[PDB]
Design a protein around this motif. Sequence first.
Motif, PDB file in Angstrom:
ATOM      1  N   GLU B 802      -4.867  -0.190   1.864  1.00 29.49           N
ATOM      2  CA  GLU B 802      -4.211   0.955   2.147  1.00 29.49           C
ATOM      3  C   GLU B 802      -5.038   2.019   1.291  1.00 29.49           C
ATOM      4  O   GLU B 802      -4.789   2.036   0.092  1.00 29.49           O
ATOM      5  N   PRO B 803      -5.915   3.134   1.907  1.00 29.03           N
ATOM      6  CA  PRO B 803      -6.213   4.046   1.175  1.00 29.03           C
ATOM      7  C   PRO B 803      -5.338   5.044   0.455  1.00 29.03           C
ATOM      8  O   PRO B 803      -4.285   4.994   1.080  1.00 29.03           O
ATOM      9  N   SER B 804      -5.617   5.619  -0.442  1.00 25.91           N
ATOM     10  CA  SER B 804      -4.734   6.475  -1.259  1.00 25.91           C
ATOM     11  C   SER B 804      -5.225   8.080  -1.578  1.00 25.91           C
ATOM     12  O   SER B 804      -6.304   7.992  -2.310  1.00 25.91           O
ATOM     13  N   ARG B 805      -4.586   9.179  -1.704  1.00 25.79           N
ATOM     14  CA  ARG B 805      -4.974  10.440  -2.109  1.00 25.79           C
ATOM     15  C   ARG B 805      -4.377  10.931  -3.276  1.00 25.79           C
ATOM     16  O   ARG B 805      -4.644  11.903  -4.027  1.00 25.79           O
ATOM     17  N   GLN B 806      -3.331  10.019  -3.701  1.00 29.84           N
ATOM     18  CA  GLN B 806      -2.875  10.286  -5.115  1.00 29.84           C
ATOM     19  C   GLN B 806      -3.717  10.521  -6.232  1.00 29.84           C
ATOM     20  O   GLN B 806      -4.499   9.375  -6.524  1.00 29.84           O
ATOM     21  N   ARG B 807      -3.389  11.148  -7.219  1.00 28.54           N
ATOM     22  CA  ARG B 807      -4.159  11.521  -8.359  1.00 28.54           C
ATOM     23  C   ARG B 807      -3.769  10.607  -9.505  1.00 28.54           C
ATOM     24  O   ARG B 807      -2.377   9.703  -9.522  1.00 28.54           O
ATOM     25  N   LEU B 808      -4.667  10.040 -10.168  1.00 24.12           N
ATOM     26  CA  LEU B 808      -4.456   9.131 -11.419  1.00 24.12           C
ATOM     27  C   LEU B 808      -4.279  10.375 -12.468  1.00 24.12           C
ATOM     28  O   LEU B 808      -4.833  11.563 -12.751  1.00 24.12           O
TER      29      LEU B 808
END
Lengths: 810, 810
Positions: B802-808
């Motif tokens: 699953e892809p994720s746009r959440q920042r590290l």
Amino acid sequence: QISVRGLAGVENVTELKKNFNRHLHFTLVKDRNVATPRDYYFALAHTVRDHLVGRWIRTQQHYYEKDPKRIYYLSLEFYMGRTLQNTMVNLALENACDEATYQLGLDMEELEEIEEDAGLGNGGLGRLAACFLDSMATLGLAAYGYGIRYEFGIFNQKICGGWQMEEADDWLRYGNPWEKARPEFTLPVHFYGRVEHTSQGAKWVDTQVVLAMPYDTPVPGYRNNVVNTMRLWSAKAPNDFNLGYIQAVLDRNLAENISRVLYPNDNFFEGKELRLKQEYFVVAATLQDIIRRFKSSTNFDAFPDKVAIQLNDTHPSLAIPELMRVLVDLERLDWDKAWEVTVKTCAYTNHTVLPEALERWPVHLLETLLPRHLQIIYEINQRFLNRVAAAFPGDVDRLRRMSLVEEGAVKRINMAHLCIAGSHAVNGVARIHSEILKKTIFKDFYELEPHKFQNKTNGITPRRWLVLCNPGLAEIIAERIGEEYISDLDQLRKLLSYVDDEAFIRDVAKVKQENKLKFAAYLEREYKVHINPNSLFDVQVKRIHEYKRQLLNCLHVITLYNRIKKEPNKFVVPRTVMIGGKAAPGYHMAKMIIKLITAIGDVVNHDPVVGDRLRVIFLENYRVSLAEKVIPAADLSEQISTAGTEASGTGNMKFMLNGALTIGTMDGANVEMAEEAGEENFFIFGMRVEDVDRLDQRGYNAQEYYDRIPELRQIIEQLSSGFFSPKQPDLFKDIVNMLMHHDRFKVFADYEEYVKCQERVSALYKNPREWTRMVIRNIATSGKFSSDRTIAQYAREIWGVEPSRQRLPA
Amino acid sequence: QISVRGLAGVENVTELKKNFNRHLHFTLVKDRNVATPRDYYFALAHTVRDHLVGRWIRTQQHYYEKDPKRIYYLSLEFYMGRTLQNTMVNLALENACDEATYQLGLDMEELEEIEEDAGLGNGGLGRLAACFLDSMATLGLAAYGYGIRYEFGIFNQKICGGWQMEEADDWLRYGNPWEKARPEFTLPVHFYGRVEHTSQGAKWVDTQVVLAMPYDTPVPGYRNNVVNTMRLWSAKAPNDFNLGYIQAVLDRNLAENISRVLYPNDNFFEGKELRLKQEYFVVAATLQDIIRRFKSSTNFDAFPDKVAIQLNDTHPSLAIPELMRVLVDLERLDWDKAWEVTVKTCAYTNHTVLPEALERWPVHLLETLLPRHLQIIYEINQRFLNRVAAAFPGDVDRLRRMSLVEEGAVKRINMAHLCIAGSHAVNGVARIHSEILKKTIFKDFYELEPHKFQNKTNGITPRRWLVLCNPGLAEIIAERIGEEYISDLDQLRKLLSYVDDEAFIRDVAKVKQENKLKFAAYLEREYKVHINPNSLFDVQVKRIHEYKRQLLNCLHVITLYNRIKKEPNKFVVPRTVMIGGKAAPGYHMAKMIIKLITAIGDVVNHDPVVGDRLRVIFLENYRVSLAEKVIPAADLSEQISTAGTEASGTGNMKFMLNGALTIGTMDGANVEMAEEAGEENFFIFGMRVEDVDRLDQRGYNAQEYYDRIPELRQIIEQLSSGFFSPKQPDLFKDIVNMLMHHDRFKVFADYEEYVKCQERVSALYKNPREWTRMVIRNIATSGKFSSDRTIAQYAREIWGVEPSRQRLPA
Ligand SMILES: CN1CC[C@H](c2c(O)cc(O)c3c(=O)cc(-c4ccccc4Cl)oc23)[C@H](O)C1
Ligand SMILES: CN1CC[C@H](c2c(O)cc(O)c3c(=O)cc(-c4ccccc4Cl)oc23)[C@H](O)C1
């Protein structure tokens, strides 16, 4: 910990720690969780390197503004070794870095062992260039070392079944943190082609082009803030090179092969085209760089006032006709003026009188590779011989003896003759050597131009060869006489007033014992070999050569073994005999000598009757970093070449400085060493040069010695019968045959005196107090053999420049 | 200056300036007095690189702790282009660096032009890999690109006398600031040898060893603090390699030649041993690295849950038998289990149906080079064909059609068949292409395993292909709809509500005019060529191919010229026709096409009657950095391949995003582009796939078109008679002969419709407002063609992640 290693200030230690951490993170892209000891080495190297750059930039700026006369030291070899500790020593950073790394939980000595040697030399000639660079920087001279950046340096030596095996020295594998690539200063070098004559002179056309890309390495002076440059050239194909497509790209390797590998020959000429290309490559690129810098200060009258070119042996001898080519063909100067400039610019250092080391290039090679240079050489020869004929009318044999062109089966160019003709100064490297030059091989040239001939006795740098490798000794010396001797080694004479000082005697002997313990520990850790640290450490380390007579040492070792076997319950002074050094891969006899040494060890080390009274060890992969470990640990230095063969030697000087006594012939710099210390404080034996000459007139008959010396007869019988090679009885037949019938170096003739002299060594070693007192007399009189003295003499007597100990602003 | 380029804060600008100065001093060892523009480039590159490292280290640490499924993208090509601007964009540093450099007295755009392209690819396939890496990082996937670090990338193209000349792309000459060498992770790769059968399985012995040394390059995601890795392998000889001495060292080049040069073939198979070595080299090193990382998390059941391997074309197809080899021979798994693991791990992307691009390796090559792999392939084939025979009993021709082994004069292995058998998913790169796969060339395989076959329509990254290369357009879009579209390109649909907005229409047209002026200025400065910036910019840039039909474009150009000459005083819409692209060095016809283009230009550009109404320019050295300049400047995008030949195309998508209208056939992704924008907003012409099929059944006769089209007859007569080559009348005889007698791509069959369609283009261009409104409808519907969409589909439908746009955390 110790004074000579500098201060560990609060500000400095804190700054080093943070910059170490910065490099680990930003430069190496690592954190402490994944970092290896090698990563830690590189973080330290980068941190220390940062301290050079400011000084490096301002030194070169200083030279631009003051415009002093520049010294260009041309060498095919620079045997640099490791750089990290040297840089710390010269910058006074050693204690600060030791403290900083300790606080980070790291051992600095362990990190230092990770650095690869820059092994861009074979031995003495290459190491001399390295010591010279250090001294030139320490003496504030505007000096540049110019050479080749070999991808592969001197091979790593492995011993397999008692035999030498070679493997590639891939020293650049992990990168080199010290060098700075300078692709912007890339220069073209020309090969092959042909000569066209036009209305306006000769033109060299239809050439193949190889690019020369420079890499600069900093050379720091000792605590004077001077940082000089060593510029090494790397070969690059031009982008249109051979431009099916794929093969044309792959064929770029042919051009780039020029800087691929160092020829592993020590004092031996191999007449291969690839070697000739290397020699021209370094010369052509270097001379363009010199001229560019000179113009960026039209009138070449001032050229010799602003430029000195030192030729390290004949290897860069093409500098002479190349300078003529540029001045005549490109700058359009008349011949006579160009020649005057060339002669006044160039000086030549000879390193040996041995005929097989002399460069004599086939005309047909130069004809194809360098057609214009051959024409220039012929013209130099014609004009030179016209001078000879006018000086010595009717002496037709002299003309043929002095010619740069040697006639015969194949015509050859004598590069040494070229160098003498085109240089204003010619020097040998030790007093006896320089006299031999004037009396024998260059006698004709000396009679024509006596003013040209000089001596410059070799030296070693006391930074690497005392402070760095033997801090314990450097400290006890500094405790008595201060620190100034490190850049003024003559001050060691002050130690003569401590020869009866009971505290000093104890300290000198303690430092040696510690060095011996450390080295005995190194041997077990890295090579799993057991040695007795209370024995006399008897060491001969140097390239394997017939002339250097490792074989004479072998004969003594066997004599000792045979004597023990004859009278087992008699006391003998225990010895550890260590022999190390590389053989040129194609030098069959030298490879046989290595096998002999290991074969003797195999018998001696496993005889229960011998015990730990005698041990014979072959020191594998001898190189600069190993020298720094073994030399401080030595008691006895073996310098036993046939008189008149070792031009100087430098290994001898390293041992003298580090508290070993010397057993040696009156050869090379041994003569001057004995003169400085007093002959009573040296173990001199064997034929002098005059005795060798007398034996040659008569004819050397080895059988005579075999017949009259029973102990020698036994050794030869043992070698012949297979005592040292039971499974291959005839293994050493070549060695025996050579010794008996074709020994140019008279091993048997010095055998008796050598053995007798060794008995006197053992006798003195039995008296520790008197051994050490003689040691003190050696160390105290080693000052003359600093390369600072050598370089000061080159500066004043050849280069016409004044050395300076004055600091530059930090 | 502009919003999308980020903030230029006081703290940031000050910090950038000081770190720039630090790198200039400590890293480059320069001061401002001697520094060149290139030195300034490197100081900036190092400064920006520093901002990556923290994020790079923590991203990889994050993957270690969370242990997600890892994606391994294997490609022989990564066409990266320049890295500096891309890194600034993704880190939001562009405005800050622009300000910092401006205050230092430097122009950042000028410095950006100094960077060499990383040209490690030929065209579409290699650029797709690069866009994919960007998207995988932006979508927060634990992804690694694995390839070869070629010393020489795609050749630099020079035009001499109208002909293509090739020269070496020496891209590493000045160093690469982006890569980090990792010699500590060096792995051995085996070649040649033989197979021994023992009590415990097969053993591969007596092999030659080449070392694989990895170099890591950071791949930053768009403003999410994710930095992924591209790991490229470099070939190194082992140190005992061939270990007279000198030759043995020089022969190390043979091993190191593996990573020397990229094969410059676009969609063409060349069956050379060196290429096969490259393919195994990357596969063997990569798979060891994968397995090592998997173990450092015994039980290979979980292997496919933790590992996905994507094969970019058949080039890394040896991954399949290599994985089997490791699992069976080394890990001792049974065949059936190893195969299950392999199939579930591997997926294969097909890039073309053209027969000459298909990899069919001679058995005798694999026999010698990779004996164990050949045995494994035979066993795979046997078991696969047993499945076919059980599914389709008695269908003997199917068995021969589906075999991995092709019988004939020389036996060959069909690598595409190998890939299908050993992968759980097979995808084409556009809907029409994927359907063609199922219907024609892989029909048999589809019938056996229909679930395996998928479509993944290609895409391009909107970071490089909009924000970076066309900031003016990105800004006017952001002014209306915000910045979120940059990582969610579907948001461009919101622009449909501005199609009647008079301000927006004016702004879109203004941005194009500025781009055209900038490019017209670039042409004069770098190539001294004069163009009219008010003319229609008609551009076809892509590799030179018969299938891509640059020749059809040539025919139109000549038609326009002939029409002008017939009626000189008639008004025509002025055009600048630009054609650019490289020909494979051995592709004779493609080299002839380049010469034709330049020959047409020579006539057209110097005819006084034409004036500045028609200009024909060949764009030299087309490459990623040139694409970034010309694509924003284009009005008309030429996408005119014969229907059924261009699998997808990606150049088409770049033009659509940047405000050019498209003239094209219903081929590849053109079909989906027209579907997204509406066919009314696209210039579609020519045969569909079905029409091509019908013509093939009947037989294509080019003479028919020649006979019935007078304008076409004139062009052929002109070509044949030497109108475009007066001094060599028969120069284009091969081209004419091909067109008339052996044209597989039916140039004549589409000529009439193409010319007619081009007339409709000129008509619309006469109405600037309606031209621009159609442009807005294209840009607004280009969202589907973001590689973020493509990668999200691979992730969900093939890789099971699953892809994720959440920042590290920063
Ligand atoms: C007769 N033959 C003996 C061996 C010699 C030779 C070789 O064949 C190969 C070599 O590598 C060397 C070498 O490195 C040094 C010396 C050498 C150097 C100085 C003085 C005396 C000698 Cl023997 O000789 C070498 C040469 O072929 C002449
Ligand atoms: C009959 N002959 C024609 C030329 C062809 C050929 C070459 O001889 C050399 C080449 O470099 C190429 C190339 O790069 C691409 C294509 C190609 C690729 C895809 C579709 C059609 C074609 Cl013609 O063909 C090439 C091959 O020898 C078969």
